[PDB]
Amino acid sequence: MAKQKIRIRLKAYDHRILDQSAEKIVETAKRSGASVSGPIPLPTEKSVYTILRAVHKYKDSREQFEMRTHKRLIDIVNPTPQTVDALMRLDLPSGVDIEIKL
Amino acid sequence: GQKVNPVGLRIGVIRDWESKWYAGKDYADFLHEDLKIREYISKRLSDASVSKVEIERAANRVNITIHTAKPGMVIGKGGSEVEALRKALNSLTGKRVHINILEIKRADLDAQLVADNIARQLENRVSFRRAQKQQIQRTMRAGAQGVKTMVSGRLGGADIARSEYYSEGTVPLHTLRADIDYATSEADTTYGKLGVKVWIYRGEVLPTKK
Amino acid sequence: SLKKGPFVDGHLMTKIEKLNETDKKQVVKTWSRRSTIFPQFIGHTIAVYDGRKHVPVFISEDMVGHKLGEFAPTRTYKGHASDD
Amino acid sequence: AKKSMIAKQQRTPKFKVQEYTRCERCGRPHSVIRKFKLCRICFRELAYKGQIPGVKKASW
Amino acid sequence: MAQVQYYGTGRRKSSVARVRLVPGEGRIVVNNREISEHIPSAALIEDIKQPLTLTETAGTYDVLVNVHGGGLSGQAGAIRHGIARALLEADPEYRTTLKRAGLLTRDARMKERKKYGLKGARRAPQFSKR
Amino acid sequence: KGPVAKRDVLPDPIYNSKLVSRLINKMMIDGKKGKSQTILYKSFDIIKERTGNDAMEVFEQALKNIMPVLEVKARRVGGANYQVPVEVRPERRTTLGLRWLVNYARLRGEKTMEERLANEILDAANNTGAAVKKREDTHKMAEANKAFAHYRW
RNA sequence: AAGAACCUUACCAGGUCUUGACAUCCUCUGACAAUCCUAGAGAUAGGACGUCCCCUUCGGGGGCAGAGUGACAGGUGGUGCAUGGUUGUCGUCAGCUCGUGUCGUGAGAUGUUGGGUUAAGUCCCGCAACGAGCGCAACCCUUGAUCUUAGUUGCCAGCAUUCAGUUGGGCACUCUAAGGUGACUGCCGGUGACAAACCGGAGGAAGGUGGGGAUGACGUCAAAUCAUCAUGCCCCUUAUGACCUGGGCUACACACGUGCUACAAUGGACAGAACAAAGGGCAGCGAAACCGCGAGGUUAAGCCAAUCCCACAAAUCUGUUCUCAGUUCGGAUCGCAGUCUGCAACUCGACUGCGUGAAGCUGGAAUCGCUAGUAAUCGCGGAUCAGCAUGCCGCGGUGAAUACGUUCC
């Protein structure tokens, strides 16, 4: 009964942009479609960075700026071509890492 | 410190980054092109002026929207100027471009503009004290819960060095919802450069839910 | 070093080759001290460029795998105050 | 001599090993992270300027 | 789908455990291994088994537990808090004696993140005047 | 300020009592509960082997025998130091007892650490050894010079 | 200094250039650019093979080179006793001030003192003062409890399957990240003016600013950085500039600061067994198979990664063995033979095999850290990075002793 299915994945630094993008990318899945799996959470990987405060010495004082990387997955049992043609247009967001695979 | 920049704290919790995008195979190259766009907008800062440019990119696309106190300076007559700028940027970025424009209401309220203006006043060799007073009066005309301002380096050419600051109303940088605008500027008198700083407390932001 | 093999810059190779086949010229300066001594190179005397001054160096049969520039120390001794 | 140094770097090295990392915004070599090719101070000032998401600062 | 059993998650310092109090002989099972075997010897294992003995004594219920993360003592402590909370879910009435026992809460504590300029997230290597 | 709360130790299963757990705390080095565990059980075993008696009894008599009744406390009010004798807190009593116990046990020089802990604890049982001698020395520094610490301070 | 073999590098020595290595204006031709040979250490010069492109009725447009030319360009040159900018320090200490008014000839004072209370100028009450601003606090992040939404690459309990959560299935649970719940002295009791607050107890996953981080107030030290950048002034310019080879930044009689490894039987050595977290990876991580004692190599699957790889956790536990000594303690120093990276490992790289087996058997005077998951200690990862991490930044394992107290520093 198992069969290959399209499984779009999203990635972004900001999360509000990411789950707004998730809602926008599943909303097209809902119309002219069926089932529509929700956006399941992924572990997310941050990158820490310690940098010196002073231009010269005083290495004892520093600061940690870091960049987290969120990830998400979305699925749909029915390929439904009409919402795939609808999928081609995406006004938002400029900052998103959608990836399509079947 | 002794004074950490509020702009380095406000971002994230209460304000958006000046340039948002995603990366990507080349995180550096997007940053290079964007910093170059800053380098040319800085050339546009010479007279047309700008408070800030917001930037967005999505693979072979860019959204370098501008907001400025004087919108017609960059548009020109017939809109030819924004087009020529669009070509000058298209020649460099190597990708499609469509620069946007915005006209801020009560533009004096913005920290970048008042800081650039008082800096130009320092270029005009007007007394720095009276200039800061006119700053506080003008921002008072702008209407705000609290405002602070500061200048450093040579002042009137007197003494080896001096630093001054004036303020009125609450200016709570330690507040995490303060939404305080921050600005810096660099005057260039023959006696020497003049450091410029200004803090603008727009007021607390109340979180929403639906 | 490692394998295949010791590495002269290669100009010294043709130089010592021509000097071996004929002429038998003696005493020649070199800036490239990195080159290792070779069996074909034997018996030659090279002025070694330490930097400050060239130091002439005869080549005994015993020396091959040692670097040609190793024999001349750039370092100046010692220098110390009250000896003994 | 930073102009001579960036001129030295932008030109192709005689050997590929020679290419040390350096930021474009400033000509200072040394202590430049390779992953972002920015100055520690370059990245510092841009960090107060805010160039990338997000939080910032000193979490976890 | 078999006979009814209670279960209680129990973690400590990044070491999580999933106990299952199935009634039976009372022999304990950790990762398909005996507690006498999985952590020899180790006497502390009896301290992992103490809360059941401190409460009336004794059933004794069989335990099928699956634990992951942490070291041996940490995962064993996870077995302890895990059988403790499961015993809490056994009957509501027992909880009163449990207040005297403490033996719950799992006090969250774990090694502190290192401070910059410090080796032990508190310790400073050295100081010297002049 | 004020007094601080102190945690009670998890009781040792063998022999039940928490005080033995206090020994598990003190004898331990490099943060190893297991090494203290092995030396503890081997200690009970070697006590079981020579001169038969309950380990808890000889241990109890030993710890009762190694607690000082008084302790001096140096204070420089003027020229040269001046120790002040005072009655010891029972927690401080067992603390000094166990610390001088493990310390002198460490220096016994025997090839087996457990056997010399045994010889030491039996020396405490027999009113002898370096530990009892040291408590006696503290007893000498005390009493003989308690007059400055009579009821003054 | 988040990587000095060359480069970096600035400094030295030698060899070379003067509108220049780098930017612009002019006139001005011409595409620019490369393919090799010759001489040289390179730097570059001497030759040929070569470029001679794109839009225009001929003026041109375009990068770009070359030529000359005045301009200029250039300095990690001097000045942090000219600075902007950025950062230490007292100090995450609770103070520093202003508006109005009052008092004082005046400077100044009152407010900010006093009583109680607090980590706090914290709150409360009173007070010739009433307010307010910058801080503390709160607001944020992280950690812990729980719910809801959402179940793959992650998850395996209930079911069958298998060498294997691996494969059917399950999407409970662990786990994952969004929105919520929760702590506020609030509930009780006592003290206190019935105020603030403290103490005790209950409730509770966490109790009395829960733990940690971020958050550093007016200012002090003419504190640090002209050498990140920017630059006032001063100085140099066929040279304080530029190119290159080699050096040096690693010196060596010694002093000091700061780490690492040990001086050993709670141990060393061997064998077996067992528990992590977090991070990194496509110019990359590189499994498995095979070759070599080892380091690595040959070859190559998979992985843009909750899939796969870096990758095995180490202490520990279980036994065997040595039986108290410069030792089966420790590893220094050096020799020989290999290996990774790189045009290239002499100066001045790392690692391995073999051999050699310093000193040190716990350290004077003196001095440092730390109140609990802290000290103690064991391994792992990353930034750095061709190669080079005992340093730095993190991750987790194991995990205490003591705090009577403000006499003294």
Coordinates of C-alpha atoms (C1' of nucleotides) in Angstrom, one line a residue, chain B residues 1-2 153 160 170-176 190-191 193 195, chain G residues 82-85 87-88 133-135 138-139 215-217 232:
Chain B
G1 CA 31.5 49.1 27.6
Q2 CA 30.8 51.5 28.9
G153 CA 35.2 65.1 19.9
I160 CA 42.0 69.2 23.8
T170 CA 12.3 58.7 29.7
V171 CA 15.0 56.9 27.8
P172 CA 15.1 53.3 29.2
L173 CA 17.6 51.3 27.1
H174 CA 17.4 48.4 29.6
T175 CA 13.8 48.0 28.8
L176 CA 13.4 45.0 26.4
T190 CA 38.7 71.2 10.0
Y191 CA 39.6 71.1 13.7
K193 CA 35.9 64.9 13.4
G195 CA 31.2 62.1 17.1
Chain G
rA82 C1' 44.4 66.3 19.0
rU83 C1' 40.3 62.5 18.1
rG84 C1' 35.9 59.9 16.1
rG85 C1' 35.0 54.7 16.8
rU87 C1' 37.0 48.2 24.9
rG88 C1' 39.0 47.3 30.2
rG133 C1' 15.3 61.0 34.8
rC134 C1' 19.6 57.4 34.3
rG135 C1' 20.4 52.3 37.2
rA138 C1' 10.7 44.0 35.8
rC139 C1' 10.4 43.2 30.6
rU215 C1' 21.1 43.2 30.6
rG216 C1' 27.5 47.2 33.0
rA217 C1' 23.9 54.0 35.8
rG232 C1' 43.2 66.8 12.5

